[PDB]
Amino acid sequence: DARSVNGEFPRHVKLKNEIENLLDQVTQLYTKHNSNYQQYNAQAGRLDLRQKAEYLKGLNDWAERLLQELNGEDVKKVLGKVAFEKDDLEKEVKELKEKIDKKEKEYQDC
Amino acid sequence: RSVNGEFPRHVKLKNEIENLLDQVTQLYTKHNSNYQQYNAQAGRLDLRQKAEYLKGLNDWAERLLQELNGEDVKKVLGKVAFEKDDLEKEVKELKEKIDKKEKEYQDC
């Protein structure tokens, strides 16, 4: 057993371990989101309306943040910003190269 | 409206987490059955064909894994950050060239 197959068999095992680790992370997120609400219910009784909202909001905020970390949603928003600046800089570089070509024309004679 | 909308938000987050869990579970199942399929056909293939076959199965799984965990977006972010940095340095260099040209020919 444990052949190479041009490294593809060890790669199969590594991908299997990475998938299992993701499945474990998402399973614990799911389990904990559900138990968070059961815990809220248990402790909800002797909280006022405003404290109830602030408590359940805090639990929801913890789950949403962890989900966006696992699925890369957070990284996609940063990519959006950096891509917009990169696009503006590409247009600025084009404009400056055109300005340099015009300045060569401007001063061709002297 | 319903614990200030936090109860419906809990249910929404629950459905979004369950959808990710289902996607990762199907990816896991299919990666493992892909190998059982490979094992079944491995016998009748040469070394080159074995590598090409298992590589194709691995490529499928890795692409989907990197989609679900956002690794594909992180790699693209790395490249776009480096292109943005290169362009900022190119803007600076081009402005320097323009200022030098202007100074060179100020008497012209």
Author numbering:
A (entry chain BBB): 4 to 113
B (entry chain CCC): 6 to 113
From the paper:
The M protein is an essential virulence factor of *Streptococcus pyogenes*, or group A streptococcus (GAS), one of the most common and dangerous human pathogens. The M3 protein is produced by the prevalent *emm*3 GAS serotype, which is frequently associated with severe invasive diseases.
M3-NTD includes the 110 N-terminal residues of mature M3 (residues 42-151 of the M3 protein precursor sequence). To stabilize a dimeric conformation, Leu151 was replaced with a cysteine for disulfide bond formation at the C-terminus. M3-NTD crystallized in several conditions with the best crystals diffracting X-rays to a resolution of 1.9 Å at the synchrotron radiation source. Each monomer is composed of three α-helices, H1-H3. Helices H1 and H2 form hairpins that pack against each other to form the slightly kinked bar of the T-shape, effectively a three-helix bundle. A key residue is Gly113, which resides at the T-junction, separating H2 and H3 ([Fig fig5]). The T-bar structure is stabilized by a network of polar interactions of several conserved residues, most notably inter-chain salt bridges of Arg52 with Asp102 and Glu105, and an inter-chain hydrogen bond between the side chains of Glu49 and Asn101 ([Fig fig5]).
